[PDB]
Amino acid sequence: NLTGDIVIIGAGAAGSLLAHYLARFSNMKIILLEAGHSHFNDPVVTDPMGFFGKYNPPNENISMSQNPSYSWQGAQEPNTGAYGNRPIIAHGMGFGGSTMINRLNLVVGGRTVFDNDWPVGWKYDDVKNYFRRVLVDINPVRDNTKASITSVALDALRIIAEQQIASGEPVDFLLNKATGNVPNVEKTTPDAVPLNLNDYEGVNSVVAFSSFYMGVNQLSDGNYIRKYAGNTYLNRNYVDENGRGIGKFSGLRVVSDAVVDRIIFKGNRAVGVNYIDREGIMHYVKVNKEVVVTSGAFYTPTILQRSGIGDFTYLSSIGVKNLVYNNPLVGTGLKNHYSPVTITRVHGEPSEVSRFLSNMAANPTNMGFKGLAELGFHRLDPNKPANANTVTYRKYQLMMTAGVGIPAEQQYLSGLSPSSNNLFTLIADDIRFAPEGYIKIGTPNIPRDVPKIFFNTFVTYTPTSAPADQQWPIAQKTLAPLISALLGYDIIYQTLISMNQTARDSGFQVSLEMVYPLNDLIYKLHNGLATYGANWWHYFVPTLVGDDTPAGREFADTLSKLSYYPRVGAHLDSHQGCSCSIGRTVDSNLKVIGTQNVRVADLSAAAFPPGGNTWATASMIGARAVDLILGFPYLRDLPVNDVPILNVN
């Protein structure tokens, strides 16, 4: 009954941008289908502080990610490395996709990752313009206030950096070789210029700064608003209430509350897509040129497999009727970030600790983030790439906030309840997280919130009856995440050690000591690390070492005991991706291998996790897909000053 030319699945962080820009530069028809609906008039989502649970009913106070009305519930299979727990990860619904419910933080990832870990045609010098376009389209803002603790932390970081430069090691977490001998630490003078970590050139990869960039804008009244993909590209100024373009965009139509399940085929060419609406009737729309799937990391492999592309044996076993192309790589090698936490309690008298722990209240500009730096590889990490000693890589993202963020079980077990106001927290996020998994469809009837998702993070090692030299590489490969977590803990401990003297000489009379990981254990870890050198990680398996002295046995016991904290005392960030990576499921032209006219243009199609948060990356992939579909580098050569017009209502 209907017809069309281009249909896009998922008005997310890339789908909305792609639809808007296809409508901008073309006369053909573009259709956008989205599972959810617009939420332009909700204080929970429109207000940035609504993410924190401000407009929630007293009997249903749950976050936006935990509402089935807002996001898909992606429960996973038990994690054998995490005591069998089943964390749930969510993808948002409606216009704007998952950007509706995020923390609104914006980063780029750096220049090294896009040059040494991506295929040709996707180096930094080809996507810097797209990064700039997206960043100036969102137009973030920085923090308003300036806490005293941030200056002390930056000074301590500068002291650590100068000590490391004086030592002269081949590679350290606080060394940047693109700037020379001078450390990349912002100065404490009131007139110090900000160290922008999303600079166009890419000089900063290991930089100590003081504020992130959030997609928040201030209105004329004086209250802040949340800016995301939906309220940037899909406002009433472009698409009306009916769901059709107005004036210049007359060729664009968007249907909301539409979920697709299957793609009609002709052997290699998609002939139509069917969707399910609120009343439950499936309609048929013709496809003339191409289709793009932008349903996210978890639901692009699912629609691909249910369409008839994937491992033939599995699809035939589960009863998939139509089979088109055979590929055992679909939905494989899923990557995600992971961030442990730590708590530090200050001592002294109430006046000084009150005047020192102030001005970190959450406001819509900092989102509770103070931020310290984005460090590199630790010197004693066994697993570094070849270019580690020559080119710096982003390994850790350091964050600090106020209060305590921990699940209540560990709060009760440790006894550090949030009643006390004399303690803060730090998060050493890991952007080089090693373990990967895969996604498989369960039943070929309807889209479902839970496919088969396997993700084993902190897996231990069992020795075999083999020579030790043949086992050590396998232990090195397997035991990477534990080493990374321990190195992050040691980094934070060194930061605290420097911060003690920095705060003592900065005019404050306080003493800072680690509390949550039982700082005596951290001290034992530091002593063992210093005494044992680079072979410290050999004591993960005491039997292979064979040492029986009390020092070695207690070091082994402490190392085993410290492995308990990252498994439960941490959080799993929702930065999943790389399920249809380039070179395995798709080529560098964003085309699936063996298909003719389908594309994937979301974070799933990425070939590697960026060195940080993953929003601008998805937006860039969408824009580059626009250029590849058109063939002309329109978005690369567009003037910077031309941006879409905001329209609140």
Ligand X SMILES: Cc1cc2nc3c(=O)[nH]c(=O)nc-3n(C[C@H](O)[C@H](O)[C@H](O)COP(=O)(O)OP(=O)(O)OC[C@H]3O[C@@H](n4cnc5c(N)ncnc54)[C@H](O)[C@@H]3O)c2cc1C
DSSP states of 367-427 as a string? TT----B-----TT-S---GGGGTS----EEEEEEES----HHHHHHHT--TT--SEEEEE
User: Which residues ranging from 116 to 175 are in contact with a second copy (CB under 8 A)?
Assistant: none
Cβ atoms of 85 and 78 closer than 8 Å: yes
One residue of 13, 44, 373, 541 binding ligand X per CB under 6 A: 13
- DSSP code of residue 563: T
Least distance from a second copy to the Cβ atom of residue 564, Å: 7
Which of a second copy, ligand X, none lies near 484, with the C-beta cut-off 5 to 8 A by kind? Answer: none
With b for 16 or more beta-carbon neighbours within 10 A and e for fewer, the 237-276 pattern comes to ebbeeeeebeeebebbbbbbbbbbbbbbbeeeebebbebb
Q: Is 42 in the site for a second copy (CB under 8 A)?
A: no
In whole angstroms, what is the distance from residue 207 CA to residue 72 CA? 36
Site residues for ligand X, window 66-95 (CB under 6 A)?
A: 90-94
101 near ligand X, rule: CB under 6 A: yes
Query: Of 558, 574, 581, 585, which lies in the binding site for ligand X, with binding defined by CB under 6 A?
Result: 574
Q: Point out the catalytic residue in the list 20, 337, 378, 575.
A: 575
DSSP classification of residue 484: H
The reply to whether 328 sits near a second copy by the rule CB under 8 A is no
Binding of a second copy by 50 (CB under 8 A): no
User: Which of the listed partners (a second copy, ligand X, none) does 448 bind, with a CB threshold of 5 to 8 Å by partner kind?
Assistant: a second copy
Contact (CB, 8 A) for 301 and 331: yes
**Which of 1, 57, 58, 60 forms a contact with a second copy (CB under 8 A)?**
60
As given in the structure block, the two tokens for residue 284 are: 């048929």
What radius of gyration, in Å, describes the C-alpha atoms of the chain?
25
DSSP E strands in 202-258: the ranges are 213-214, 216-218, 224-226, 252-255
Q: Does 446 bind a second copy (CB under 8 A)?
A: yes
337 as an active site residue: the answer is no
386/408 with CB nearer a second copy: 408
User: Can residue 77 be called a binding residue for a second copy (CB under 8 A)?
Assistant: yes
Alpha carbons 622 and 127: distance in angstroms, whole number: 12
Count Cβ atoms below 10 Å from residue 495 Cβ, excluding itself.
Answer: 24
Residues counted in the chain: 649
Residue 11 binds to ligand X (criterion: CB under 6 A): yes
When asked if residue 488 is in the footprint of ligand X (CB under 6 A), the reply is no
State the Cα–Cα distance between residues 543 and 563, nearest whole angstrom. 18
| 270 binds a second copy per the rule CB under 8 A | no
Residues 6+ apart with CB under 8 A from 333: 436, 437, 438, 578, 579, 581, 584
Among 165, 259, 434, 568, which residue interacts with ligand X (rule: CB under 6 A)? 259
Contact between 391 and a second copy per CB under 8 A: no
Which residue number, 108 or 341, has a Cβ lying nearer to a second copy? Answer: 341
Q: Does 61 participate in binding a second copy (rule CB under 8 A)?
A: yes
Interaction site with ligand X (CB under 6 A): 9-14, 33-36, 65, 90-94, 97-99, 101-103, 105, 259-260, 294-296, 299, 303, 447, 574-575, 602-603, 613-615, 618
Q: Which residues are catalytic?
A: 575
List residues binding a second copy (CB under 8 A). Answer: 35-37, 60-62, 66-69, 73, 75, 77-78, 80, 83-84, 86, 88, 93, 257, 259, 261-262, 274, 276-282, 306, 318-322, 407-409, 412, 442-452, 454, 564, 568
